Symmetry: none
Subunit: 101 residues, 2 copies
């Protein structure tokens, strides 16, 4: 039930639905709470999915196509916004990431 | 001579020096250019094949077990490496692609 040190470097968007990193590790956004700053819980999920799909065939989105880890552990949105890392925890063979833009 | 735009989304290692894609197409590495990093010539031409090889089976390769195409522009190797597919073409029904680290 503890947090995860090592953080992914990049979170490409695969599907609307699905993000992939450099460890070929699928992450899915499952909730997007909002009040000023929204927050996305990307749960690591198995796949059993494919076909790297385009922005074009994506496309209107609340979340960036890309997510780039910066020197200070902030994630930067493909559209120049910055997202704080809220946690990279794990709860019973369940590994989630919650980003707060 | 013939720039082709839809390149394989997934290179699988069938054996040593034999890859396949989603299409069950044959891709053949003939040259690797150790310039300072890797340059890999891949060329299509189907070869009759049965039981694929195991990674152990194909032994510690020059090449990877699998390349998988990311939305970014590039193929991720089974090793967190990325490869610049610098060209995809055909010279008289002759498919060629170049992959570099």
């Amino acid at each position: 039930r503890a947090e995860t040190p090592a953080h992914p470097n990049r979170l490409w968007i695969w599907e609307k639905h699905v993000y992939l990193d450099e460890f070929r590790r699928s992450w899915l956004p499952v909730v997007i709470k909002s009040n000023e700053k929204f927050q996305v819980i990307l749960r690591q999920e198995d796949v059993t999915l494919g076909e790297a799909m385009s922005p074009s065939q994506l496309v209107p989105y609340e979340l960036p196509l890309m997510w780039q880890l910066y020197p200070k552990d902030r994630y930067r949105s493909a559209d120049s916004m910055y997202w704080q890392i809220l946690y990279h925890i794990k709860f019973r063979d369940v590994e989630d990431m919650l980003l707060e833009l």
